[PDB]
């Protein structure tokens, strides 16, 4: 049972620059002191990435501003989030996000992650509902509150869970019937922007889902310190978490491989003529 959190449909999203982000290891082979050219669905350098702010707005403005819209999935998406206290917890992928078609549910409680692809009738605004208490000063159990019905399940997988301080990055890609996740976790300290630096994502898992993926919606966990059974959707706060979504595109890259096998630099071969001449000169 889910009670609609917000009446406002949308707010005008503002975009930031993804400076040299979202580079993932193309293959599982080791290379040292090697400049390597590889073609894949990479995220274009200096692109436009939508900036989402799920934070509590000041009391003068309307009481609710947190946003979790159903966003398109276009040949893979790039996802980042700068947060503390694990506000973001899971994502939902699927075509219609309703009962007739299958969809992928990937939700991660701090101790564990559940990855189920099953027909799901979804709530408009799905959220994991945590509660907190004042006398004990401890944080308590949660309520899932993400789907009304689950039927015809075909794959279950459970594994170890995968200012601002934490910067988590994920790249999702569906190719040839497999769903592949690339991840990287990096402590940072710039509060409101993507860092100016290079980080390489490592292959976490590839799954044999075999489902059509057209749209995805992020899952945020919300906290309220009082619970009554007959009244909900009143008193939820989003804390302070921001997530960023970019879109992948078929592009050619040239990668600098370090002595110890790390990826330290890469070049977009279509940014400008200078980048193209660097890509061809290698």
């Amino acid at each position, epitope marked *: 049972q889910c009670v609609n959190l917000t009446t406002r449909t949308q707010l005008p999203p503002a975009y930031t620059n993804s400076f040299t982000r979202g580079v993932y290891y193309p293959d599982k082979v080791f290379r040292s002191s090697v400049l390597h050219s590889t073609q894949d669905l990479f995220l274009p350098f200096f692109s436009n990435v939508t900036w989402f702010h799920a934070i509590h707005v000041s*009391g003068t403005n309307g009481t609710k501003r947190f946003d979790n819209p159903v966003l398109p999935f276009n040949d893979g998406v790039y996802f980042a989030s700068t947060e503390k206290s694990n506000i973001i917890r899971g994502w939902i992928f699927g075509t219609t996000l309703d009962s007739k078609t299958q969809s992928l549910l990937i939700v991660n409680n701090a101790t564990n992650v559940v990855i189920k692809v099953c027909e799901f009738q979804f709530c408009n605004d799905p959220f994991l509902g945590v*509660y907190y*208490h*004042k*006398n004990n000063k401890s944080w308590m159990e949660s*309520e899932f509150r993400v789907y009304s019905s689950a039927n015809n399940c075909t794959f279950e997988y459970v594994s170890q869970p995968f200012n601002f301080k934490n910067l988590r990055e994920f790249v999702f890609k569906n190719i040839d019937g497999y769903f592949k996740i690339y991840s990287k976790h990096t402590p940072i300290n710039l509060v409101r922007d993507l860092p100016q630096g290079f980080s390489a994502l490592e292959p976490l898992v590839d799954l044999p889902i075999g489902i059509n993926i057209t749209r995805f919606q992020t899952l945020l966990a919300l906290h309220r*310190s*009082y*619970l*009554t*059974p*007959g*009244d909900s959707s*009143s*008193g939820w706060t989003a804390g302070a978490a921001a997530y960023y979504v970019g879109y992948l595109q078929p592009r050619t890259f040239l990668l600098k491989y370090n002595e110890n096998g790390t990826i330290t630099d890469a070049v977009d071969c279509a940014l400008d003529p200078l980048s193209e001449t660097k890509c061809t000169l290698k």
Partner: antibody
Amino acid sequence: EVQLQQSGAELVRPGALVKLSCKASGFNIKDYFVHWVKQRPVQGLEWIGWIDPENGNTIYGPKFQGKASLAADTSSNTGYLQLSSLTSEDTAVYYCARWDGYETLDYWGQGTSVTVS
Amino acid sequence: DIVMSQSPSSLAVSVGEKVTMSCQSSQSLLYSNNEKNYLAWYQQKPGHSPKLLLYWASTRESGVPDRFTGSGSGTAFTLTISSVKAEDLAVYYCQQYYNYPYTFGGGTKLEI
């Protein structure tokens, strides 16, 4: 033991606001929630709502939603209730209560009784 | 909103007699997620501020041991005394904690 200190009996004119004070010892109001209560022998006792000192906001009941306001300040261990203007319905006994999260009301003061000429 | 009814209105029994009071609700009190019944019971004397008796049917709290024993259902709720005691002149109420407002029952009185 927890005990509460409450406004004494009041005799007032209609057509004007009224203020109440509910006091606590042994804890900070931030630690809990605060309910308010008005009681009538005939027509029974009524439930007003809860105010959160930590939130800075308050969720009221619907019967009392009109003609009611709640305020709190942590500097003193005191919570306050006020009404827009005194009607015959408001000419009643009043109580304040403390509500634990995920729980019931646990503390009730001596009370306050409003009689009107 | 939830509405509460109480019975008996008033009953007179000798000290040591067994007495039972029952209050009935028009909606369910069970909450599936916790499987917990959000109901409490109160006892009050004239001119004494109402004080909570232990909720969730676990009525046992500090005081004289097992003063009053209670039983509840999804829609029905009863309180029992195995032997009426002379000191415990009491008036009782039934309240619910499922949705606003927390209902107050019609009241129950016990006379000796």
